[PDB]
Design a protein around this ligand. Structure first.
Ligand SMILES: COCCCc1cc(Nc2nc(NCc3cc(C)no3)ncc2Br)[nH]n1
Ligand SMILES: COCCCc1cc(Nc2nc(NCc3cc(C)no3)ncc2Br)[nH]n1
Lengths: 272, 278
């Protein structure tokens, strides 16, 4: 990987067919830019490109490659951010993926405090669909949150950061979406992502609310150990609150599965 | 030590002391002729100082001046001569409002929407009365509201001596909660207490009622509380709460003290809302 990467003709795009545009966002040693891809024959497709920052290390490269390779194995679904291609040869790695013009679901919800009760349940349905798909492909997210759900021009929910390779790192605290087993016992399962979906559900029905405002890490632990559970939001049926509460069962085996959650939300949507 | 006050003195032999309530004891007063009335009696503990006596006397004298209202814990008498000071006050059999509401949470009989709005009305009435007598509570919370056998709300601890320049903000209550979470910012940061800061605390109490004894800012320590307040943070609307009653809480938590409603206004609004609530 130091002088050259392996080629995968299934996915390789010519660099002349990609025009890089305005940055969308960055992270530790990776960054995401808006771009235009020609012929993924001669139609331009607005895509998002993920690539390393200039200060990245060999291990950052190896992380980014592993992310791309997981996206290949997992395959396509409408409610996830899909791999569309890659430039791997003769220069920096560009991992080309779908563009979601409306940004993350947290912001999306906050800027519309105008969604109906149906639309809100529909969001929740789409997210669980994406998660039901990923879980069928052995994919555990480990940070399912509204910040990691992107929304498209046409209001499709698309899970992101599912292929990625310090409890005090924030400006909110991710530990506030972690299942107790994952936080306390470092047990990550599909059921631990169910707990996280519980909190996303709550974010959804508070239209982008912040879990546990003002609660620092040590206190959160203390709340968890006491069996504390966030209060029902206003503008939330008692059914939905029991879905959240169900996702928040202490025993993961008694939490519902994403398969079960999709079935319920499909029913609930139709009756909203 | 004590000076005699014939307006209030009950002979010691007329008071039959019973079980501890939590110091405060349950008692029976004979007379107050051949009838016994259940009463609560406040008295000193064994390890009490002269400062503690002084503070108990001040509380009693304050009750004398304030006079009687249905929605406060009313002074009934005192034993001041030839033995321990006993301040005799009304008995509330169903305990504090926090516990009263939590015991009535669904799985004791549930409270209607009207019952909850009626609690709010009665507390506001008591506060309006206290305000009228020039009294500022300084720790209005559901824990300092007591409930009688016939479900009458009575405000307690309204006459208490407190040095505000010696408050421990870190000190938790017995239930595990922090009293700073009921305090107007201007009282908290600037030690300025007014009827207006009491109205702020009433907003928090209204919140406590509609969450059926919920704990404000759960898991938020003192330093983080300050930072939420400085940022103008406000608690979210409880579920099963009208927009109209959440607007009331929000009004009580106005950042500018002059712009909060008075208890006179709160009393009138709540009266109107009680009559229209199912
Ligand atoms: C590897 O795929 C990462 C997501 C690709 C993507 C990004 C967008 N649109 C937007 N992205 C961002 N920030 C980049 C980002 C957010 C997350 C989560 N991950 O990366 N900001 C605004 C927009 Br609009 N579409 N597809
Ligand atoms: C001088 O006013 C003291 C309150 C008089 C009173 C107390 C009760 N009933 C109960 N009291 C307590 N704990 C003592 C207490 C609570 C507060 C507030 N202040 O003192 N526990 C249970 C009951 Br029931 N009735 N009247």
């Amino acid at each position: 990987s130091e002088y050259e990467l392996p080629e995968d003709p299934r996915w390789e795009l010519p660099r002349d067919r990609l025009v890089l545009g305005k940055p969308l966002g960055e992270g530790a040693f990776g960054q995401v830019v808006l771009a235009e891809a020609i012929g993924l024959p001669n139609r331009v497709t607005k895509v998002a490109v993920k690539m390393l920052k200039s200060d990245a290390t060999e291990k950052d490269l190896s992380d980014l490659i592993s992310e791309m390779e997981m996206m290949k194995m997992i395959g396509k679904h409408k409610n996830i951010i899909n791999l569309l291609g890659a430039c791997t040869q003769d220069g920096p790695l560009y991992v080309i993926v779908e563009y979601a013009s409306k940004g993350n679901l947290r912001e999306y919800l906050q800027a519309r405090r105008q969604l109906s009760s149906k639309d809100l349940v529909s969001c929740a349905y789409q997210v669980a669909r994406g998660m039901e798909y990923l879980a069928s492909k052995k994919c555990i997210h480990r940070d399912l949150a509204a910040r990691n759900v992107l929304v498209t021009e046409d209001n499709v929910m698309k899970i992101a950061d599912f292929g990625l390779a310090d409890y005090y790192k924030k400006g909110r605290l991710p530990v506030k979406w972690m299942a107790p087993e994952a936080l306390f016992d470092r047990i990550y399962t599909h059921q631990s992502d169910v707990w996280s979906f519980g909190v996303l559900l709550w974010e959804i029905f508070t239209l982008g609310g912040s879990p546990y405002p003002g609660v620092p890490v040590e206190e959160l632990f203390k709340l968890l150990k006491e069996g504390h559970r966030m209060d029902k939001p206003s503008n939330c049926t008692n059914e939905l609150y029991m879905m959240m509460r169900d996702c928040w069962h202490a025993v993961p085996s008694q939490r519902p599965t994403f398969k079960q959650l999709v079935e319920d939300l499909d029913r609930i949507v139709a009756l909203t």
